[PDB]
Amino acid sequence: MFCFQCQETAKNTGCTVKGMCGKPEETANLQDLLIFVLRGIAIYGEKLKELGQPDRSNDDFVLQGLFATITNANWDDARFEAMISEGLARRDKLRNAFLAVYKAKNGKDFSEPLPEAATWTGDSTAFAEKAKSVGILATENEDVRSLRELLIIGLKGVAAYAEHAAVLGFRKTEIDEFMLEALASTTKDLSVDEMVALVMKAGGMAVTTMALLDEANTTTYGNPEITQVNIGVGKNPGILISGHDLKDMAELLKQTEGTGVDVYTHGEMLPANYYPAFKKYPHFVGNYGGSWWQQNPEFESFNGPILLTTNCLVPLKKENTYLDRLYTTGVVGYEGAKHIADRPAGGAKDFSALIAQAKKCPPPVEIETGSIVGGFAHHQVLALADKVVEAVKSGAIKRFVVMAGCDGRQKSRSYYTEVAENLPKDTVILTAGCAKYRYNKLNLGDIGGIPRVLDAGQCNDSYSLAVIALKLKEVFGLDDINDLPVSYDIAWYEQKAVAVLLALLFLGVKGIRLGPTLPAFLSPNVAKVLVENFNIKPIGTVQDDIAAMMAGK
Numbered sequence: 001m002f003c004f005q006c007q008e009t010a011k012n013t014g015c016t017v018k019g020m021c022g023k024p025e026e027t028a029n030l031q032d033l034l035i036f037v038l039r040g041i042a043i044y045g046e047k048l049k050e051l052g053q054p055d056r057s058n059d060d061f062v063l064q065g066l067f068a069t070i071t072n073a074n075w076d077d078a079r080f081e082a083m084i085s086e087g088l089a090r091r092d093k094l095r096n097a098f099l100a101v102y103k104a105k106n107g108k109d110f111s112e113p114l115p116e117a118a119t120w121t122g123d124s125t126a127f128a129e130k131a132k133s134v135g136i137l138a139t140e141n142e143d144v145r146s147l148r149e150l151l152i153i154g155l156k157g158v159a160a161y162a163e164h165a166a167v168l169g170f171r172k173t174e175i176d177e178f179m180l181e182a183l184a185s186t187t188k189d190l191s192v193d194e195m196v197a198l199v200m201k202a203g204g205m206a207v208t209t210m211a212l213l214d215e216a217n218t219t220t221y222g223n224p225e226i227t228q229v230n231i232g233v234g235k236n237p238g239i240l241i242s243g244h245d246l247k248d249m250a251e252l253l254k255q256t257e258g259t260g261v262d263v264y265t266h267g268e269m270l271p272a273n274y275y276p277a278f279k280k281y282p283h284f285v286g287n288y289g290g291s292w293w294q295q296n297p298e299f300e301s302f303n304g305p306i307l308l309t310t311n312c313l314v315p316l317k318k319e320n321t322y323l324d325r326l327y328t329t330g331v332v333g334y335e336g337a338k339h340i341a342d343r344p345a346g347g348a349k350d351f352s353a354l355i356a357q358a359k360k361c362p363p364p365v366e367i368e369t370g371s372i373v374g375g376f377a378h379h380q381v382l383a384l385a386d387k388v389v390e391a392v393k394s395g396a397i398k399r400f401v402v403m404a405g406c407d408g409r410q411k412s413r414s415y416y417t418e419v420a421e422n423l424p425k426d427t428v429i430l431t432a433g434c435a436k437y438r439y440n441k442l443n444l445g446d447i448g449g450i451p452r453v454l455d456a457g458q459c460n461d462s463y464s465l466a467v468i469a470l471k472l473k474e475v476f477g478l479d480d481i482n483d484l485p486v487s488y489d490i491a492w493y494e495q496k497a498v499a500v501l502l503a504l505l506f507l508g509v510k511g512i513r514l515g516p517t518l519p520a521f522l523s524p525n526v527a528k529v530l531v532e533n534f535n536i537k538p539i540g541t542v543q544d545d546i547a548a549m550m551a552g553k
């Protein structure tokens with residue numbers, strides 16, 4: 001196999017036998033084959049749009065297909081085989097539509113050679129063998145490989161955010177068109193300038209998509225607000241919801257109301273605690289445990305059903321006993337875990353089985369007590385603009401440190417905790433995404449009532465951090481967003497973090513420190529381009545990085 005899309009890739013070069021995440025060769029190769037089929041759909045979909053007869057019938061299939069190949073999202077080979085079969089059928093329908101339109105417009109049959117992604121076909125018996133030759137290493141030129149894979153990785157992060165917006169009824173034609181432009185481009189031989197322009201275009205589409213998801217979430221469930229979240233437990237059995245989808249949370253809360261089953265969040269569902277629509281349910285207890293990578297022991301000790309709405313689902317350890325109470329939904333899948341089917345249009349998902357099972361379970365084991373404060377998304381922060389600006393002017397807040405991003409297992413991530421603990425006491429950390437779990441349970445206090453850690457939400461709520469920065473730029477009358485007293489020391493793990501990074505690069509942010517390591521999918525020449533144009537840097541020691549950031553460098 002060959003996969004190198006997440007921060008934990010083997011040796012920082014690529015996983016070749018079994019993923020470090022646990023992804024076996026057969027699963028990795030099937031994900032490559034699904035992406036190959038998506039490029040085929042994109043070739044014809046792009047041509048139909050160019051001929052003036054766009055077909056948007058595969059929009060959701062394409063977003064879900066890309067999302068299913070995100071790190072820790074779907075482990076069920078049967079799901080991938082089904083998606084590949086369905087994608088071949090969808091591709092063929094687009095091909096037949098294209099051939100007729102091309103002939104009508106040109107007065108002759110189409111006869112230009114097409115990449116194999118547009119024509120290869122087979123039943124499911126042929127998939128395992130074909131998958132081995134349509135992987136990442138089929139691109140021989142290292143620079144072309146790096147630019148194509150950077151684009152696809154960024155694109156799958158954008159697709160995830162767009163799928164959440166779509167679930168809530170929010171969509172933009174430009175996003176779905178770009179999905180096919182970007183996928184089809186990886187089957188073409190383009191110049192370096194063209195390839196880099198597509199990557200920057202993906203960063204601009206990441207801004208569009210994060211803005212759309214921000215609108216979707218806040219219009220539907222209200223603007224997040226300051227909230228004190230309990231991290232201890234109640235006395236009833238509960239259901240633990242993890243991942244990012246807030247519509248699944250809305251339905252779970254409604255279906256569990258009055259049943260004697262409590263609702264708890266985990267990981268990236270922590271920010272559901274900040275929304276006014278969900279704060280009205282007294283049975284919504286709080287947030288359980290920490291970061292996604294500690295879920296084996298935490299899902300175990302939770303004792304009740306666990307619902308994964310999105311990635312990060314980690315394979316069970318041999319001694320784990322919660323497979324019979326593990327539920328997947330959305331693009332998530334796992335062999336032997338019960339899956340909650342998609343909601344009918346205008347209807348809801350059916351969580352009754354989780355509720356019936358939870359009534360047979362003991363209450364969660366308390367793993368800690370106290371609380372976490374959060375809910376500092378853009379509306380809430382801009383509502384406190386005068387207080388924030390005055391603190392910056394008085395010198396009470398000397399600098400902001402954006403430490404948003406994604407957490408991971410490697411020991412080198414103690415750097416983020418130590419940076420948080422060692423930053424001067426007149427600095428405020430801004431965060432979003434599960435990178436927050438390295439420092440959101442510390443006792444850093446506040447600065448005149450402003451918490452020293454301000455959690456804006458999920459990794460998509462890095463959007464709010466950009467809105468805040470842009471507001472500060474205008475208030476302070478600065479010509480360049482980089483001249484604000486803000487430093488960026490971002491942690492990454494999977495592909496949604498890559499989309500966030502590309503969005504910040506599109507917004508003109510320079511000097512970002514990215515880590516705990518730099519991506520394996522950046523070749524030496526591509527990495528040099530990023531350093532030349534954007535001054536992206538690796539992490540150094542805690543002391544060196546704090547000193548540099550306090551100097552604005």
Ligand code: SF4
Nearest residue numbers: 003006015019020021
């Ligand atoms: S998702 Fe990450 S750890 Fe898993 S196979 Fe790919 S690069 Fe390796």
Ligand SMILES: [Xe]
Nearest residue numbers: 196199529530
């Ligand atoms: Xe790039």
Ligand SMILES: [Xe]
Nearest residue numbers: 381384388450
């Ligand atoms: Xe604030």
Ligand SMILES: [Xe]
Nearest residue numbers: 381388454468
């Ligand atoms: Xe802020």
Ligand SMILES: [Xe]
Nearest residue numbers: 382385388471
């Ligand atoms: Xe602000």
Ligand SMILES: [Xe]
Nearest residue numbers: 405497500501
């Ligand atoms: Xe990020």
Ligand SMILES: [Xe]
Nearest residue numbers: 402404462465
């Ligand atoms: Xe960010």
Ligand SMILES: [Xe]
Nearest residue numbers: 462463466503
């Ligand atoms: Xe962003």
Ligand SMILES: [Xe]
Nearest residue numbers: 466469507509
């Ligand atoms: Xe920004």
Ligand SMILES: [Xe]
Nearest residue numbers: 465468469486
């Ligand atoms: Xe900011």
Ligand SMILES: [Xe]
Nearest residue numbers: 492497498501
């Ligand atoms: Xe990244």
Ligand SMILES: [Xe]
Nearest residue numbers: 498501502530
């Ligand atoms: Xe990047």
Ligand SMILES: [Xe]
Nearest residue numbers: 143192525526
């Ligand atoms: Xe390059």
Ligand SMILES: [Xe]
Nearest residue numbers: 527530531536
């Ligand atoms: Xe880089």
